[PDB]
From a paper:
Herein we demonstrate that MnaA functions as the previously uncharacterized 2-epimerase that interconverts UDP-GlcNAc and UDP-ManNAc, thus providing the corresponding substrates of TarO and TarA in both S. aureus and S. epidermidis. Wall teichoic acid (WTA) is an anionic glycophosphate cell wall polymer in Gram-positive bacteria that is present in roughly equal amounts to PG. WTA is synthesized using the lipid carrier bactoprenyl phosphate and a sequential series of cytosolic-exposed plasma membrane associated Tar (teichoic acid ribitol) enzymes, starting with TarO and TarA. Genetic evidence is provided demonstrating that MnaA is essential for WTA production and β-lactam resistance in MRSA and MRSE.
The MRSA COL MnaA crystal structure was solved at 1.9Å resolution. The protein crystallizes with a dimer in the asymmetric unit. The structure is closely related to that of other bacterial 2-epimerases (root-mean-square (RMS) deviation differences with E. coli MnaA in Cα positions for all atoms in a monomer between 1.40 and 2.90Å depending on the chains being compared), and a similar dimerization interface and quaternary structure is observed. While there are significant structural differences between the E. coli and S. aureus models, they are located on the protein surface, away from either the substrate binding site or the oligomerization interface. Surprisingly, there are differences between the two monomers in the S. aureus MnaA structure: the RMS. deviation in positions for all Cα is about 1.0Å. We refer in the following the structure of the ternary complex between MnaA, UDP and UDP-GlcNAc as the “closed” form, and other states of the protein, either in apo form or a binary complex with UDP, as the “opened” form, consistent with past structural characterization of the enzymes. In addition to differences in the quaternary structure, other significant local structural rearrangements distinguish the two monomers. Notably, His 205 to Gly 211 (E. coli His 213 to Gly 219, B. anthracis His 209 to Gly 215) differ significantly, but in the monomer nearer to the closed form adopts a conformer similar to the one observed in the closed form. Collectively, crystallographic results described here allow for a more refined understanding of the enzyme regulation at a structural level: a dynamic equilibrium between the opened form and an “intermediate closed” conformer of the enzyme is present in solution in apo form or in presence of UDP only. Mapping of MnaA LOF mutations isolated in MRSA COL Δcap5P into the S. aureus MnaA structure shows that all the sequence changes are in close proximity to the substrate binding site or the UDP-GlcNAc binding site, therefore rendering the enzyme inactive.
Residue numbers in the entry:
A (entry chain A): 1 to 38, 44 to 60, 67 to 376
B (entry chain B): 1 to 62, 66 to 376
The structure:
């Protein structure tokens, strides 16, 4: 009945938007129109078929704006939903605004308050914050950023992060894997590293710290689904290669990654999405960054921001291994990012906003 | 020297940026690189000749709002990468302002926002200007706020304290260049025995009935008051002109004319009885001419002139426009209250303050200018 356009252009966004597309599909009064800019394995896992598959930073924005406008004018959606902070999020929000279509921002209000870090993500989410009619903040902290900036009180709602909802479709407590069977008698670290700010010396530092832990603790193993970057793979192979307790593998599909994460000892990562998922797996996370836009997990105790200095990475992981009570406290901390029903809240906020229902959902929480 | 790129694309924007380009020219340590995008093409040239400015780049851009933005960002990036400016200056809230600010940001060039912080706090009014100035507020490194009220909007939104500076509006600086001692006009001479209303209206007012309402209210005042006249420099839009002709045409004491060059418009505004307009720029200039303004907008981002007393916001309802104008005509005390009010928008030296803030920011000078106000 009411057309809800969902625009997304990356695999991490597809994971976060997929459960919302399923909730919009299940809702009788709303019809989702899926637009991919833009991944295929995520779309098949959640059984989503895009209606549109489109397809310098200036050229990306320029092309995205005009093509998304063509799709918006053809479909005439009642609302456009954009996610987070990528080039597509801003281009989709701006094309919607120019066509006077209401905008819902999924995962609204994250802030580093530094224009050049993350670049261009910090500016993208701040620019979308200007356009959006509804801000689906994942946490009360993100909602406070928007309320303090002067966004209208009633337009800011706390729903939780849809990353936790996606886990309901992927986790299988009877999951099977030959790599997991190989390390049945080991405690494995699950590591991922993709941030441009960690290319070069940060990566060498991280790998030497992890290699030292692998040498010192014989019952430890490492599973590292590596980004395809040839330089980082060369560096990974020199420090971490030819070791039977280290698995240097390709990126995992989301079913395999979530099930690996659920069996890991702890996670080492610079990922934003893994920080929101990890507390629901009861897995401590050591965040390989110097600044965070997810302080909620730090306050809850689920994560610890350790930077990329070789000594700090090594010492922080060693403390997690040696102090079982600290490990258990980080594992048991509740997820401040959601309870798995963010999509249902978002759907009911959309219905309320479009005058299809009288009840407005309460803030998650 | 440092390269200061000044990007602007419309005649109103050229009027406000021209005195700043002249101050950047006069400044020994800075070089202005003038980039014009020409959404307004013909009228933009007479502004450039009045102030003696020759653009280094003249891009042909100018179509949906998406297409304008899409074309402007890539072409302005090409100019930014070729020139490698030390700072990009954008003005106000047009499509060029945002596209130039975004291309500068993607190339990590510092951004100075001339006329920063105006807010209606309504996403669809002015559309797309309110959103454009809010989007540029996210990108800018220096916010040259025209008034303390505009600076308060930026400070309340969380912009860094030292990045927000009050300079006054460059619209008042431009009026120093539009004085013509040998000024004459045959239209003014024809109405030497009349009190004329000077009216201007944007093309967007003709989407729905606002323009028709305004014109019927004004025609009624011309019919009722024989000593009144109307001077209306019309946008070229054929649809605007059909509606003007159909309501205000074939009428004694009404001049339906072409857009005026800025020297004539400023000199017509000084001899008018009062101004009837939806213009943003005229609201900032009018107090310096001691002229009352009836603002044809439902929401304003210029409350300073309302507080000072030169401006009254009256909307576009036919009865309200007619009653508000009739009250100005009948109540000489109220006309006097709106006339003698001081200008809260500037003193004519905003450009010098902007230039010294730029020098300070790029570490060329130690003194930071004080806040105008
Ligand atoms: O090999 C991998 C690594 C990550 N993930 C998932 O991808 C998201 C995180 O993506 P990434 O770290 O690349 O991006 P970020 O979240 O930092 O933007 C989370 O949902 C992870 O569970 C995945 O499916 N396979
Ligand atoms: O025929 C005209 C009408 C206006 N102006 C000037 O143009 C600016 C206002 O332009 P406009 O109202 O079209 O745009 P706005 O300010 O509303 O964006 C002010 O400097 C006016 O003095 C002009 O030179 N000639």
């Amino acid at each position: 009945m009411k057309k809800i356009m969902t625009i997304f252009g990356t695999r991490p966004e597809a994971i976060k938007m997929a459960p919302l597309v399923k909730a919009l599909e299940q809702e009788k009064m709303l019809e989702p129109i899926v637009v991919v800019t833009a991944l295929d394995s995520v779309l098949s896992t959640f059984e989503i078929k895009p209606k549109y598959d489109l397809n310098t930073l200036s050229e990306i924005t320029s092309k995205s704006i005009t093509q998304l406008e063509q799709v918006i004018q053809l479909e005439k959606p009642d609302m456009v939903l954009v996610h987070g902070d990528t080039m597509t999020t801003f281009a989709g929000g701006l094309a919607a605004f120019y066509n006077q279509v209401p905008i819902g921002h999924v995962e609204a209000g994250l802030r580093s308050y530094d224009k050049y870090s993350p670049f261009p993500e910090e500016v993208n989410r701040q620019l979308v914050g200007v356009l959006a009619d509804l801000h689906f903040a994942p946490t009360k902290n993100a909602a406070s950023h928007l309320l303090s900036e002067g966004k209208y009180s009633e337009s800011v709602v706390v729903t939780g992060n849809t990353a936790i909802d996606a886990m309901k479709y992927t986790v299988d407590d009877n999951y099977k894997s030959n790599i997991m069977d190989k390390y049945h008698d080991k405690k494995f670290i699950l590591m991922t590293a993709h941030r441009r700010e960690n290319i070069g010396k940060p990566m060498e530092n991280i790998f030497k710290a992890v290699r030292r832990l692998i040498d010192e603790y014989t019952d430890l193993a490492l599973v590292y689904p590596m980004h395809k970057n040839p330089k980082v793979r060369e560096v990974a192979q020199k420090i971490l290669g030819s070791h039977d307790r280290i698995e240097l593998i390709e990126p995992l599909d989301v079913v395999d990654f979530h099930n690996f994460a659920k069996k890991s000892y702890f996670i080492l990562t610079d990922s934003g999405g893994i920080q929101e998922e990890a507390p629901s797996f009861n897995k401590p996370v050591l965040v390989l960054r110097s600044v965070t836009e997810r302080p909620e997990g730090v306050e809850a105790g689920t994560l610890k921001v350790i930077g990329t200095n070789k000594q700090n990475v090594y010492q922080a992981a060693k403390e997690l291994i040696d102090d079982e009570r600290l490990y258990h406290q980080m594992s048991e901390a509740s997820n401040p990012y959601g309870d798995g029903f963010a999509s249902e809240r978002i759907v009911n906020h959309i219905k309320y906003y479009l005058n299809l229902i009288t009840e407005k959902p309460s803030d998650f929480g």
